[PDB]
Symmetry: C3
């Protein structure tokens, strides 16, 4: 398990220094800052103390730390045989930072930011690319690969592109490798299913993935040990935070949530069964009954419930995940384990899914959330419609605008609104393929890539604002 390098795209103690630099580099990065202004479930404009993408990530970060520490206590002396000796901090820092940036890629407005982009390109890309690369001329395999690549947007892939090629953070390949939750390319279609279901990286980062797989020591089409821990971390804190916000927002009552938890639990298992990992041998209904009994703390009745519920129930989940990592140590180190550590049908498995099940019935169906999903759908599409004039330009006109040359006055205004990082990332990519025979295909591919970087990098209010301004209303 010594697949831990310190090499950047540009003695264990030296690695720890480099991994410490990654910690400061990530926390100070703009990718983390955007997470505070992106809503998680309930829209931030209407809710005061509600979880954001950053505060969600911080919980996952500590939960991720809780797993790694609990993990090594279990391994004890045998960790040295596998190679985990003296990797307590390094694996800690890898898991900790990976959790924090687990969501830097994904766009505003939940998954409907994702849907809006793919839907727009699904509808208008084919006609747009046809004008840029006429049918017949141009390499057909790369074309069909570029077409499906742009049509399949995924946050995890953008997160790699964001840290590597847009924010140019130049983190160690080991730290970046945590973001490879999915391993399939977006050029390859959806089917080995679970670890290749969603796009893992973009075509623009294929060369970087080649360097990452070589430098960090892995096989193509495989994951990384940190990603399993991060996936389990997000699974554990997937909704418990969101459910607490719902109770505070008034959607359900604590007493009603308890029986609601019990009734929704019946699908997975029986509540009267004992829970693994609890010293006091508490059952799920006994834990829920224990949590409700402790509430009614006289200051924070709601807060105490989720606190008492967390101490009792987060411990088995964290303990479960650690045993799963050690049980499949060989499968994980190869990168060939094809399921999430949590997902195995066990009694603690029911914990994670019961939270998922309760949220879908009562939290995400709330009109305030679905109104934001629908509204963000318009904003992303309108933005794409607003900046589509840049896509209709032929490559000579656009590159002049991207370079600052005076062309075409309306598109020039659109170009001047784009972030410099995104224009320059476009310019730098084009400098690389400026002599390629297939430049026309890569130009428009990177043009759309630039336009897709723009919209997903927005915060909620940053996106709505730009939409409103262009609307001139």
């Amino acid at each position: 398990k010594e697949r831990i390098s310190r090499q950047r795209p540009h003695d264990l103690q030296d690695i720890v220094y480099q991994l410490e630099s990654d910690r400061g580099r990530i926390v100070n990065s703009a990718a983390v800052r955007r997470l505070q202004q992106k809503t998680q479930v309930f829209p931030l404009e209407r809710n005061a103390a509600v979880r954001s993408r950053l505060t969600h990530s911080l919980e996952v970060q500590q939960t991720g730390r809780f797993i790694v520490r609990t993990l090594f206590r279990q391994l004890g002396p045998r960790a040295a045989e596998v190679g985990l000796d003296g990797l307590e901090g390094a694996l800690e820092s890898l898991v900790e930072m990976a959790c924090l940036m687990h969501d830097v890629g994904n766009p505003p407005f939940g998954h409907f930011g994702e849907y809006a982009i793919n839907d727009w390109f699904e509808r208008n890309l084919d006609a747009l690319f046809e004008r840029r690369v006429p049918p017949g001329q141009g390499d057909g395999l790369l074309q069909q690969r570029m077409l499906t690549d742009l049509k399949h947007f995924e946050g995890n892939a953008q997160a790699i592109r964001l840290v590597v090629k847009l924010l140019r953070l130049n983190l160690t390949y080991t730290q970046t490798a945590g973001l490879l939750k999915y391993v399939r390319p977006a050029y390859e279609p959806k089917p080995n299913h679970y670890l290749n279901k969603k796009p893992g990286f973009y075509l623009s980062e294929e060369a970087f993935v080649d360097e990452l797989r070589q430098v960090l020591g892995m096989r193509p089409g495989t994951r990384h040990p940190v990603a399993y821990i991060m996936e389990a971390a997000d699974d554990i804190s997937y909704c418990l935070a969101d459910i607490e916000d719902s109770v505070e927002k008034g959607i359900l009552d604590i007493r009603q949530l308890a029986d609601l938890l019990v009734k929704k639990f019946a699908v997975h298992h029986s509540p009267d069964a004992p829970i693994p990992g609890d010293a006091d041998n508490m059952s799920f209904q006994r834990m829920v009954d224990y949590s409700l009994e402790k509430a009614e703390e006289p200051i924070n009745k709601v807060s105490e419930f989720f606190i008492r519920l967390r101490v009792k129930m987060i411990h088995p989940l964290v303990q479960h995940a650690a045993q799963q990592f050690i049980d499949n140590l060989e499968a994980v180190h190869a990168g060939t384990l094809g399921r999430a550590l949590m997902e195995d049908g066990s009694l603690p498995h029911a914990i994670v899914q019961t939270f998922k099940d309760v949220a879908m019935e009562w939290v995400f169906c709330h009109p305030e959330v679905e109104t934001l999903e629908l509204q963000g759908y318009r904003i992303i599409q309108g933005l794409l419609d607003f900046y589509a004039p840049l896509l209709r330009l032929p490559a000579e006109e656009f590159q002049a605008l991207a370079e600052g040359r005076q062309a075409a006055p309306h598109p020039q205004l659109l170009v001047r609104r784009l972030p410099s990082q995104q224009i320059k990332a476009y310019l730098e990519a084009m400098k690389g393929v400026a002599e390629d025979p297939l430049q026309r295909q890569w130009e428009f591919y990177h043009r759309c890539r630039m336009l897709q970087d723009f919209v997903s990098g927005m915060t909620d209010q940053h996106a709505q604002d730009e939409y409103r301004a262009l609307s001139a209303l």
Copy 2:
């Protein structure tokens, strides 16, 4: 005048009792409540004490009552010869409730909500319908009957659909018959009395109560609506500052002069007052009144002039009682070229010249056109869905499409369930695809026309995300 209700599968006190339930059902219904939030002429958002659809319906309700009172007073003992034995409350209540709901069907924003709907379907229904039932399959006559059906929306027809098939109020067929002001249906080519979807209900109504004729209640309600059609709006104009009391009089006299001579006495006035004598009498009461000159003008003008109009409308009903009882009279009770006809038209003409053309009013009409059409454009993704896919969403099943799913979850439960029930009737029908999309479009017209002004503006604004 029967007492059968549509959910009734089976004595004047028995008939009068059932009609009393119709009063409670109508007054408490949401159809009435929306009328308070639908503007009549001047937009409610910008005007406080201005008449809305509900306050208009209330005024019309009383005028309709005053006719039945005058009708029985004029006919007197002769009522037995015609057959109006013991019908004081029933005809009073029938006319009263029919007037209250005379305007519930039509969408927000005056007629431009209607125009917006017809214009939207006229423009893009055909291409939308072609995808649903490909060329070849399906009765083409039924299709051509459905196209103009969906393309010809009329408020009165939707009023039939709303109380019967949307609010499920289950009113007596007689009370609903008041809503059949005009005769033509929507498949035959003026405004439709009913839509193709309500033919089965109309079939039961025509039998229980000849096909293609108007019920006696509608003529009184038609006359009721005409009397208070515009006099109310003019008062709002004077209050809005568009007209002055002295200025309005000269307009009333001048516009009346074209139709008849102002100095001619009006039939039905005990003092044999003419239009000029009445208007000079009403204006004289103004400037004599020292607290509320505007109010005094229209009350005096109402008191002197409403009574002859009511007498005339009742007199024409009895004059053509046989033609009315048949239902074959092809004109409104008021319109005959007489002196009171000139009164009604003088109010309408003054209104068209100064009130309905007001920029505040026409902006709202223009704005309501945009709102209704945008709302139809916003929910058109549901129309593009194939018939199988929609049913999953309407049933609450988890369909692949998340964006149409969000659109369906915004729709009222009543309209979705009414759609689901419509498909249950033609479940394994041979031509169900033609009917499925027909009820799909039908549901969307229920949604937009059921909105209030602000409900529409809000939903338009919300989906726009601006």
Copy 3:
């Protein structure tokens, strides 16, 4: 000379001066001038208080134009009689001043993007709309292709002629109108331009002496005013602008070269240093003093150059055949004019607040045209009824028509009454499109935003 007193509804000189003085009143009291106060020049008026508007820009150009004319007669002196500009000091002054004041009444709101938005809209959708009115075959093809480029190429100067003459009906002298022929006109004003050239004795395709003077006026105060607004807004500093002015001036000529027309023989670097020195020494209004001291030293040579160029090319100018602007000759004062333009392009017009207003104004004008496009799709019979107020079967367009200004509708009715012509159908749709361009281009900034917002119903 080229100066008559005839209005559309050798001579006593005082009669012209009275008539031209009446033209002054007609212009100042006109709505065309009033709209200029509510149309932003560079920085959006909604967000900036003491920023120049089209009216405040035009007022400076008026003074600069006056200073040119005043300086011009001093140079000519007794030789002024030889050319025929004898005793025309007041008349040519007042003529030039008003030409400056209305030099910008034509162009639409939102900078050049109001112009750009209209042409872009007509270039995209004019063809299909016109074809419905004139199917292939029928209609003069020469006139059709000529009407197309006329409608597709909107220009403020052309609209300025049309507005005062055919829309506001000011009935100004042809000489006052002749100043607006900087470039140049619509097909709708060909007959009016022909009478103007005949009345003034102009061969076709030539300029007017006032236009050369006005152009020099606009060139001189083109940008120095906008630059001062930037300093107040914080875009630039006084010290930063000075090094920028000298550095950007270096491309054209050498800064230490002396500037013609300065009694003290000052160079560009010396003038900027003189202006900067008076500032910071001035203790209350450093910004104003900089531009006052700068204007004092630098406007005087510019005006002298334009007057001197006028007499140098008097023969070409009175002919109307001079094919360059008085300012642009590669000289030292020309380098002054370009230095201001150069510095402005780098720091002023490129400002995001400005470009947002342009992008938004591009949106508003295009949306407004889309909103009123239903009027273009109507056939001529429907519209003529709508313009006359008769109750036509159409319900939505009648609301749209009732929103249009009466002057623009009445101007259309009068044009159609003029043309029954065999190609009336060809002229009807051209004048229909023209009225829509009159509507949109006549709006102020906020008037355009408001109508757009209202129709959007949001």
